[PDB]
Amino acid sequence: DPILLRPVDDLELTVRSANCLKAEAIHYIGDLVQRTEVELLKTPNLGKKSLTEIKDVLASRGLSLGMRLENWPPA
DNA sequence: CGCCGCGTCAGACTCGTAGGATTATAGCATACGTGAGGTGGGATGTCAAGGCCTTTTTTGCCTAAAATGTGATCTAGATCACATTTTA
């Protein structure tokens, strides 16, 4: 999709969550959605609420978590 | 009074078309200011690490306390080929 290929700062993320993302080598939103929730919760600084509001904003702009890709990355 | 001469003053309306100018003019010296150039220097703006507080993420922990396991003893369901037997 045209929205697979965006950096996450178009979502206007937060500093703690941003540190969580850059800390975990998660580059593309296609790389985001291929990651699973429990693969996030165990990670540093990602407990209750990061998952809450990131779930909110992805509920806003029409996508969800944990989805599955194929032919990734086209780069 | 009544010419005559001279002078003043208007001459329809909307569109289109082209580019366009020219002569010759003394010369050098003095001395002064202003434009374009340097130039250190306050001062502002940036970028990378640290101390105040609350919130957040782990994470102790606290005791109610319901749940998860132990296994031998049963139980009330469940079958199948033969013998009719009923109903549309």
Side-chain angles (χ1 to χ4, degrees), chain A residues 43 45-46 49:
Chain A
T43 56
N45 284 331
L46 199 153
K49 297 182 75 176

mmCIF file of all heavy atoms in Angstrom, chain A residues 43 45-46 49, chain B residues 55-58:
data_model
loop_
_atom_site.group_PDB
_atom_site.id
_atom_site.type_symbol
_atom_site.label_atom_id
_atom_site.label_comp_id
_atom_site.label_asym_id
_atom_site.label_seq_id
_atom_site.Cartn_x
_atom_site.Cartn_y
_atom_site.Cartn_z
ATOM 1 N N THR A 43 10.228 -6.061 25.438
ATOM 2 C CA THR A 43 11.340 -5.180 25.125
ATOM 3 C C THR A 43 11.491 -4.088 26.178
ATOM 4 O O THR A 43 10.624 -3.904 27.034
ATOM 5 C CB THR A 43 11.128 -4.571 23.741
ATOM 6 O OG1 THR A 43 9.864 -3.894 23.708
ATOM 7 C CG2 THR A 43 11.179 -5.661 22.677
ATOM 8 N N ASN A 45 11.266 -0.655 28.096
ATOM 9 C CA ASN A 45 10.432 0.539 28.223
ATOM 10 C C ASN A 45 9.034 0.423 27.620
ATOM 11 O O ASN A 45 8.278 1.400 27.649
ATOM 12 C CB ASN A 45 11.110 1.785 27.634
ATOM 13 C CG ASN A 45 12.200 2.338 28.530
ATOM 14 O OD1 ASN A 45 12.154 2.205 29.752
ATOM 15 N ND2 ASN A 45 13.128 3.058 27.934
ATOM 16 N N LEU A 46 8.670 -0.737 27.080
ATOM 17 C CA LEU A 46 7.383 -0.925 26.405
ATOM 18 C C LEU A 46 6.527 -1.837 27.287
ATOM 19 O O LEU A 46 6.486 -3.054 27.095
ATOM 20 C CB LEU A 46 7.589 -1.501 24.999
ATOM 21 C CG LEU A 46 6.420 -1.332 24.027
ATOM 22 C CD1 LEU A 46 6.963 -1.306 22.607
ATOM 23 C CD2 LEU A 46 5.355 -2.403 24.208
ATOM 24 N N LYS A 49 1.488 1.282 28.390
ATOM 25 C CA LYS A 49 0.763 2.365 27.735
ATOM 26 C C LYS A 49 1.233 2.650 26.310
ATOM 27 O O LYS A 49 0.436 3.139 25.494
ATOM 28 C CB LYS A 49 0.869 3.622 28.591
ATOM 29 C CG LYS A 49 0.229 3.463 29.966
ATOM 30 C CD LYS A 49 0.311 4.748 30.756
ATOM 31 C CE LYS A 49 -0.697 5.776 30.231
ATOM 32 N NZ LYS A 49 -0.731 7.030 31.022
ATOM 33 P P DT B 55 2.197 12.394 38.195
ATOM 34 O OP1 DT B 55 0.828 12.840 37.868
ATOM 35 O OP2 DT B 55 2.444 11.642 39.444
ATOM 36 O "O5'" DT B 55 2.734 11.524 36.972
ATOM 37 C "C5'" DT B 55 3.084 12.182 35.761
ATOM 38 C "C4'" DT B 55 3.587 11.201 34.725
ATOM 39 O "O4'" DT B 55 4.980 10.873 34.990
ATOM 40 C "C3'" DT B 55 2.842 9.881 34.696
ATOM 41 O "O3'" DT B 55 2.687 9.430 33.363
ATOM 42 C "C2'" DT B 55 3.720 8.964 35.524
ATOM 43 C "C1'" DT B 55 5.129 9.488 35.223
ATOM 44 N N1 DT B 55 6.187 9.329 36.326
ATOM 45 C C2 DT B 55 7.485 9.025 35.979
ATOM 46 O O2 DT B 55 7.844 8.812 34.836
ATOM 47 N N3 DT B 55 8.357 8.958 37.036
ATOM 48 C C4 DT B 55 8.074 9.174 38.371
ATOM 49 O O4 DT B 55 8.921 9.092 39.249
ATOM 50 C C5 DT B 55 6.714 9.513 38.659
ATOM 51 C C7 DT B 55 6.285 9.761 40.077
ATOM 52 C C6 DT B 55 5.854 9.587 37.637
ATOM 53 P P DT B 56 1.735 8.182 33.036
ATOM 54 O OP1 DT B 56 0.899 8.562 31.882
ATOM 55 O OP2 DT B 56 1.096 7.756 34.300
ATOM 56 O "O5'" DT B 56 2.755 7.036 32.599
ATOM 57 C "C5'" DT B 56 3.711 7.285 31.576
ATOM 58 C "C4'" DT B 56 4.812 6.244 31.603
ATOM 59 O "O4'" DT B 56 5.669 6.477 32.751
ATOM 60 C "C3'" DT B 56 4.315 4.801 31.710
ATOM 61 O "O3'" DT B 56 4.801 4.033 30.616
ATOM 62 C "C2'" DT B 56 4.834 4.311 33.062
ATOM 63 C "C1'" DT B 56 5.989 5.258 33.377
ATOM 64 N N1 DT B 56 6.231 5.551 34.866
ATOM 65 C C2 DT B 56 7.506 5.492 35.379
ATOM 66 O O2 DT B 56 8.477 5.171 34.721
ATOM 67 N N3 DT B 56 7.600 5.818 36.714
ATOM 68 C C4 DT B 56 6.570 6.188 37.559
ATOM 69 O O4 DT B 56 6.741 6.458 38.738
ATOM 70 C C5 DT B 56 5.278 6.246 36.955
ATOM 71 C C7 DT B 56 4.081 6.624 37.777
ATOM 72 C C6 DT B 56 5.173 5.936 35.661
ATOM 73 P P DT B 57 4.369 2.497 30.443
ATOM 74 O OP1 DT B 57 4.119 2.244 29.005
ATOM 75 O OP2 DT B 57 3.315 2.218 31.444
ATOM 76 O "O5'" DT B 57 5.674 1.703 30.898
ATOM 77 C "C5'" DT B 57 6.954 2.196 30.535
ATOM 78 C "C4'" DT B 57 8.056 1.292 31.052
ATOM 79 O "O4'" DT B 57 8.403 1.669 32.413
ATOM 80 C "C3'" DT B 57 7.698 -0.188 31.116
ATOM 81 O "O3'" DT B 57 8.845 -1.004 30.884
ATOM 82 C "C2'" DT B 57 7.164 -0.325 32.530
ATOM 83 C "C1'" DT B 57 8.106 0.613 33.303
ATOM 84 N N1 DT B 57 7.574 1.238 34.590
ATOM 85 C C2 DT B 57 8.454 1.497 35.617
ATOM 86 O O2 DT B 57 9.637 1.213 35.577
ATOM 87 N N3 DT B 57 7.891 2.097 36.710
ATOM 88 C C4 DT B 57 6.570 2.467 36.872
ATOM 89 O O4 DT B 57 6.149 3.001 37.885
ATOM 90 C C5 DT B 57 5.714 2.190 35.763
ATOM 91 C C7 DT B 57 4.259 2.539 35.840
ATOM 92 C C6 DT B 57 6.247 1.605 34.689
ATOM 93 P P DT B 58 8.676 -2.493 30.301
ATOM 94 O OP1 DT B 58 9.201 -2.486 28.922
ATOM 95 O OP2 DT B 58 7.302 -2.955 30.578
ATOM 96 O "O5'" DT B 58 9.609 -3.386 31.236
ATOM 97 C "C5'" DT B 58 9.179 -3.710 32.545
ATOM 98 C "C4'" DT B 58 10.312 -3.547 33.537
ATOM 99 O "O4'" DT B 58 10.007 -2.457 34.450
ATOM 100 C "C3'" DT B 58 10.550 -4.739 34.437
ATOM 101 O "O3'" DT B 58 11.898 -4.746 34.900
ATOM 102 C "C2'" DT B 58 9.540 -4.485 35.541
ATOM 103 C "C1'" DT B 58 9.668 -2.978 35.726
ATOM 104 N N1 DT B 58 8.405 -2.291 36.197
ATOM 105 C C2 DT B 58 8.366 -1.685 37.434
ATOM 106 O O2 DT B 58 9.303 -1.678 38.211
ATOM 107 N N3 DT B 58 7.171 -1.080 37.733
ATOM 108 C C4 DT B 58 6.042 -1.019 36.939
ATOM 109 O O4 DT B 58 5.014 -0.454 37.298
ATOM 110 C C5 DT B 58 6.156 -1.668 35.658
ATOM 111 C C7 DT B 58 4.994 -1.677 34.703
ATOM 112 C C6 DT B 58 7.313 -2.263 35.358
#
